[PDB]
Design a protein around this ligand. Structure first.
Ligand code: AMP
Length: 394
């Protein structure tokens, strides 16, 4: 009913199930609740400015996920920033978001002004300080859960925003396995990482993470992939083009893989077809959606029949609870098959950009009493409700 409670509950029912694995380093669902309980208790002690979000700075280690959960457990949203982003990223966001604190899962490469910092050693000490924690004031409802920055703009995603997204991924559109084993390659500063983080966590699965050092080195990456017992794949189409440079990337060397999930770029017919050849018995999905409406809002299963019917791959069909439509420069409905701007309304739409009211007023509006978003995207929709992506209004 609350995603934090769902995840905490897996600590009680499957304490010893592995939840995270980085190149052979593993942690359990029990240690995840214990770490995030310990962090939350500690933040409760600091009397931090309430609502004010916390920046979480780091790469792809377990502590990243543990830290997120302790922050939302404390009542506040987390802002994830990746180690391999330039230093001014952390300076800009700190200046725009005015966070209550920065938690340095990885060492900060630069200072963050007056924002208090918890060092990696201090964080280590907190996680090793077990508490018996009442999670009585966790993030819930319309309150900010994460703020992911795209200038860069801080997309505020509430708890209920994320559940609209998560519920869709757990539905029969995708048929994800129970307790999935999922790849975690997109850095957590990126929206797409959510597509593997929270559907796996809601389902009690396990995250098999790749640090950037591995993806920076095709030798290492090609060597690493067969060692991961993953069922669910999440990445950009371009990253899959890299992995397909390996003839060995196929169902015989990766027998556990059953679901491929792509977002963030156009999936070319050549990429989907090479992959259909490599993994003929898997299910492949194209998805699309702006960060401002929580990860994705359309999907289409690229079946054999899809590959033969479509040259360019469509972006698919809307979530049941999300209303999508195509309008012209005046905000008026555009006929089926005519190009216009894609408008998105429903429960996953962000309440707006943090500390940027001018962008929020231009992009976000209300549609029949639902929050609605101007994507910058041109596309089409036929009468069957199938969407296609056709460029940007910019
Ligand atoms: N599967 C996809 N096919 C085509 N364009 C996409 C897809 N996924 C994301 N994009 C584009 O990426 C840009 C930013 O939106 P998004 O990355 O979906 O948040 C927009 O141009 C999107 O339409």
């Amino acid at each position: 009913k609350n995603i934090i409670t769902t995840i905490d509950d897996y600590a009680r029912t499957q304490p010893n199930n592995v939840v995270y694995d980085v190149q052979g380093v593993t942690h359990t669902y029990a240690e995840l609740k214990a770490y995030s309980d310990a962090l939350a208790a500690h933040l409760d002690t600091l009397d931090l400015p309430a609502k004010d979000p916390i920046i979480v700075f780091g790469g792809q280690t377990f502590e990243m996920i543990a830290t997120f959960l302790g922050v939302v457990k404390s009542g506040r949203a987390y802002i994830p920033i990746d180690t391999h982003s330039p230093n001014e990223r952390l300076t800009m966001i700190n200046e725009i978001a005015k966070p209550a604190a920065v938690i340095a899962v990885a060492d900060l490469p630069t200072g963050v002004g007056t924002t208090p910092v918890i060092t990696p050693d201090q964080l280590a000490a907190i996680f090793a300080t077990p508490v018996d924690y009442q999670a009585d004031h966790v993030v819930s409802g319309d309150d900010n859960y994460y703020i992911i920055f795209t200038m860069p703009k801080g997309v505020q995603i509430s708890h209920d925003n994320l559940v609209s997204y998560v519920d869709w991924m757990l539905s029969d559109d995708f048929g994800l396995p129970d307790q999935p084993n999922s790849l975690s390659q997109p850095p957590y500063s990126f929206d797409l990482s959510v597509m593997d983080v929270y559907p796996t966590l809601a389902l009690g699965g396990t995250l098999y993470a790749l640090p950037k050092a591995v993806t920076d080195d095709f030798k290492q990456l090609f060597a690493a992939l067969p060692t991961l017992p993953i069922n669910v794949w999440v990445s950009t189409p371009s990253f899959m083009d890299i992995c397909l440079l390996e003839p060995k990337f196929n169902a015989e060397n990766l027998p556990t893989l059953t679901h491929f999930l792509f977002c963030g770029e156009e999936l070319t017919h050549k990429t989907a077809a090479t992959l259909k050849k490599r993994f003929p018995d898997a299910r492949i999905f194209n998805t699309y959606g702006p960060t401002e409406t929580c990860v994705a809002v359309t999907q289409i299963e690229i079946t054999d029949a899809a590959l033969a019917q479509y040259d360019r791959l469509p972006i698919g069909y809307a979530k049941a609870d999300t209303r999508i439509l195509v309008v012209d420069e005046n905000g008026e409905a555009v006929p089926n098959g005519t190009e216009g701007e894609l408008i998105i309304a429903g429960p996953s739409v962000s309440k707006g950009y943090l500390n940027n009211p001018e962008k929020t007023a231009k992009a976000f509006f209300e549609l029949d009493g639902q929050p609605a978003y101007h994507s910058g995207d041109i596309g089409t929709m036929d009468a069957d409700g199938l969407f296609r992506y056709r460029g940007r209004v910019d």
